[PDB]
Amino acid sequence: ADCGLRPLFEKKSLEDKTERELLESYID
Amino acid sequence: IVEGSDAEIGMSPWQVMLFRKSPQELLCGASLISDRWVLTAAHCLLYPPWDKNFTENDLLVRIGKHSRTRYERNIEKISMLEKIYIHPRYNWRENLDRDIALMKLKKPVAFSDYIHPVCLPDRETAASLLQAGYKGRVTGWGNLKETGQPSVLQVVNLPIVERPVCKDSTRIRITDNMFCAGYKPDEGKRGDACEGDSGGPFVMKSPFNNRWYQMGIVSWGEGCDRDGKYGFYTHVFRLKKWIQKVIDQF
Amino acid sequence: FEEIP
Ligand SMILES: CC(C)[C@@H]1[C@@H]2[C@H](C(=O)N1Cc1ccc(Cl)cc1)[C@H](c1ccc(C(=N)N)cc1)N1CCC[C@@H]21
Ligand SMILES: [Ca+2]
Ligand code: NA
Numbered sequence: 338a339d340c341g342l343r344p345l346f347e348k349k350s351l352e353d354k355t356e357r358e359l360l361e362s363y364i365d
Numbered sequence: 366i367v368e369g370s371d372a373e374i375g376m377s378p379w380q381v382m383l384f385r386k387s388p389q390e391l392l393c394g395a396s397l398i399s400d401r402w403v404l405t406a407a408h409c410l411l412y413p414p415w416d417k418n419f420t421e422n423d424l425l426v427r428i429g430k431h432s433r434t435r436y437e438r439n440i441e442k443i444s445m446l447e448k449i450y451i452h453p454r455y456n457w458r459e460n461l462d463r464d465i466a467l468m469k470l471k472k473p474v475a476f477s478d479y480i481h482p483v484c485l486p487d488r489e490t491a492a493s494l495l496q497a498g499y500k501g502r503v504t505g506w507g508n509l510k511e512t513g514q515p516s517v518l519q520v521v522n523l524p525i526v527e528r529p530v531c532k533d534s535t536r537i538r539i540t541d542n543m544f545c546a547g548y549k550p551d552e553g554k555r556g557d558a559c560e561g562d563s564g565g566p567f568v569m570k571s572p573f574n575n576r577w578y579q580m581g582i583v584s585w586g587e588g589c590d591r592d593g594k595y596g597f598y599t600h601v602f603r604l605k606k607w608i609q610k611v612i613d614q615f
Numbered sequence: 616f617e618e619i620p
Contacts, residue, residue, distance in 0.1 A: 339481075339486035340398075340482045340483060340485075340576065341482075341483055341484035341576030341577035341578060342481075342577075343375060343376070343378055343481060343574070343577070344375060344476075344477070344479075344481055345373075345375030345376075345378075345478050345480040346375065347575055347576070348411065348594065352526040352615070353373050353600070354373060355370075355375050355502075355522055356570055357498060357501045357523060357568065358498070358522050358566050359501070359502065359570050360570070360572055362498060362524065363379060363494070363499055363572045364499075365530055384616075389616045390616070425619075434616045434617055435617050436617045436618065436619050436620070443619060
């Protein structure tokens with residue numbers, strides 16, 4: 338149910354240092 | 366991982382180390398897909414040309430790690446293998462087509478801040494995310510250079526490459542069960558997986574539901590971080606019917 | 616590698 342949601346990041350609404358780079362690449 | 370950076374604590378809580386018992390060494394990466402199941406590359410377990418043929422009793426799974434070499438007391442969990450399942454059409458003779466394997470753990474692992482499963486993509490996930498230029502993330506404890514070893518888990522983000530560019534970079538026959546990723550010579554950024562990282566995950570964070578999905582497995586390459594070469598990855602969605610079949614039966 | 620218990 339909770340796959341892919343990291344306890345230390347998504348679960349607490351914190352972002353890691355480079356996940357924004359991924360998001361910015363998702364342009365379509 | 367060549368030209369990456371230190372991971373943050375808990376950044377890849379699905380990361381698994383495949384650890385050889387005797388001698389003690391890093392064999393490969395892998396990932397946690399449930400409390401009981403670990404995903405890796407078939408070549409981590411079976412490669413007859415190099416007389417590689419591990420049995421369940423030969424290796425351990427170490428989960429929740431950050432440091433490469435330290436026994437991370439009160440944090441990592443060590444699991445034994447009940448059974449290994451290699452894709453029956455894994456093509457080790459030619460081009461590593463269908464380079465995928467599952468390992469069932471003897472006991473379920475408890476989740477924690479450091480230990481948590483990654484999602485597997487469905488058809489819609491794959492169609493949305495597996496597009497040229499879209500970036501994914503590779504993690505591992507492998508070599509820092511082609512020709513040393515990291516203190517802690519490394520991370521690098523790399524773009525998926527157009528299929529013709531992938532095909533034109535190598536003499537090996539590429540199949541629909543593979544994709545390639547990495548920067549082009551003209552792009553100026555660098556990064557690749559390397560020895561010790563194979564079997565590990567290539568993940569992408571869906572911008573639709575904010576979950577991480579394992580789109581690839583580090584499969585093969587020619588050297589590491591070479592200009593004009595790209596890492597090749599097993600296409601997880603394309604092999605999902607087999608993954609489901611094995612989990613449903615066993 | 617450090618020894619595992
Ligand atoms: C065991 C074997 C698969 C090995 C295997 C991976 C690899 O590329 N192989 C060499 C090879 C053999 C046959 C074919 Cl067809 C292509 C490549 C793997 C590997 C995986 C990925 C990269 C990369 N630069 N992205 C580089 C190397 N390599 C490291 C540790 C195991 C070993
Ligand atoms: Ca070619
Ligand atoms: Na390259």
